[PDB]
Amino acid sequence: DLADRFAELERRYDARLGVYVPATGTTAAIEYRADERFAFCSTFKAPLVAAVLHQNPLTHLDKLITYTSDDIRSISPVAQQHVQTGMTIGQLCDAAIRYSDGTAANLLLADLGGPGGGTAAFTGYLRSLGDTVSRLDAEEPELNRDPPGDERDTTTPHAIALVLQQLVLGNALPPDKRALLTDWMARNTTGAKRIRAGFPADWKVIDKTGTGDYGRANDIAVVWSPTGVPYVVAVMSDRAGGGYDAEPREALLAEAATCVAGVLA
Numbered sequence: 634d635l636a637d638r639f640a641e642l643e644r645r646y647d648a649r650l651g652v653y654v655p656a657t658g659t660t661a662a663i664e665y666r667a668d669e670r671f672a673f674c675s676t677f678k679a680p681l682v683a684a685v686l687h688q689n690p691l692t693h694l695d696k697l698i699t700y701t702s703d704d705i706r707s708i709s710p711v712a713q714q715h716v717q718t719g720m721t722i723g724q725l726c727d728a729a730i731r732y733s734d735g736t737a738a739n740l741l742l743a744d745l746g747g748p749g750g751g752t753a754a755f756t757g758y759l760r761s762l763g764d765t766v767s768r769l770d771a772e773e774p775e776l777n778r779d780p781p782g783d784e785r786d787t788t789t790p791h792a793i794a795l796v797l798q799q800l801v802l803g804n805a806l807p808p809d810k811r812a813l814l815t816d817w818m819a820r821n822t823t824g825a826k827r828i829r830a831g832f833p834a835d836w837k838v839i840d841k842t843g844t845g846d847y848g849r850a851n852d853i854a855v856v857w858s859p860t861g862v863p864y865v866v867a868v869m870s871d872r873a874g875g876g877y878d879a880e881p882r883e884a885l886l887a888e889a890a891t892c893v894a895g896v897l898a
């Protein structure tokens with residue numbers, strides 16, 4: 634039983650686990666705590682890049698953005714190397730997705746603009762995709778820090794899976810912008826030990842990860858079978874029982890994905 638297995642994993646890792654795979658032709662939806670709120674963490678960067686792509690001509694990607702010392706306030710493996718020179722919007726999108734750069738996300742939020750440093754417009758984008766659940770309230774690093782239970786900066790496995798489905802598989806973006814978003818997620822460097830680890834090598838995996846305080850570890854993916862059948866997989870977890878400093882546990886997501894992969898194979 635799938636639900637029994639997910640509950641076992643929760644006891645093993647002293648964690649709360651959320652899983653959603655939308656229904657397809659012949660497979661029913663997989664759901665475990667799928668309508669419970671979990672912090673976005675860095676998973677919001679996937680729809681953020683889509684929002685920025687949608688809002689502008691494609692050659693906005695070539696616009697240079699400048700920033701400084703006081704702009705580096707969170708984990709930013711790329712933006713710290715380029716503070717002296719600046720980064721184009723395209724470079725910022727690449728870094729936000731592939732390295733989960735926090736400063737890049739902040740700069741992209743500012744580019745989208747409006748109240749709350751871009752967070753209201755970000756939420757507005759999700760609303761336009763029929764998501765009435767998710768909300769973004771703060772930027773990096775505050776968005777990862779809300780107490781367990783707090784609804785600020787949250788999505789649900791269910792809501793984020795439906796958003797990602799429209800972005801990658803549906804027609805939320807035109808084909809050329811859709812391909813840019815897909816390729817970046819395909820070239821993600823942070824996801825090897827999460828959903829990727831649960832699926833056989835001949836299945837294609839594209840993803841965006843999230844990690845935060847209270848043992849928070851997320852992964853949202855689109856996967857393709859060897860025969861080109863796509864599936865959207867959302868896995869979210871936290872470990873509130875360990876407090877603010879609870880270690881995130883990638884292995885939980887890898888195990889949960891393995892259980893998902895077994896059903897879809």
Ligand SMILES: *C(=O)[C@@H]([C@@H]1N=C(C(=O)O)[C@@H](S[C@@H]2CN[C@H](CNS(N)(=O)=O)C2)[C@@H]1C)[C@@H](C)O
Nearest residue numbers: 674675707708732733734735823842843844845
């Ligand atoms: C988003 O959730 C934050 C940012 N994103 C992360 C992610 O995994 O999505 C990390 S980035 C980086 C990848 N793992 C590194 C830790 N090294 S370790 N412990 O050996 O795996 C961190 C980071 C939290 C947010 C800052 O934007």
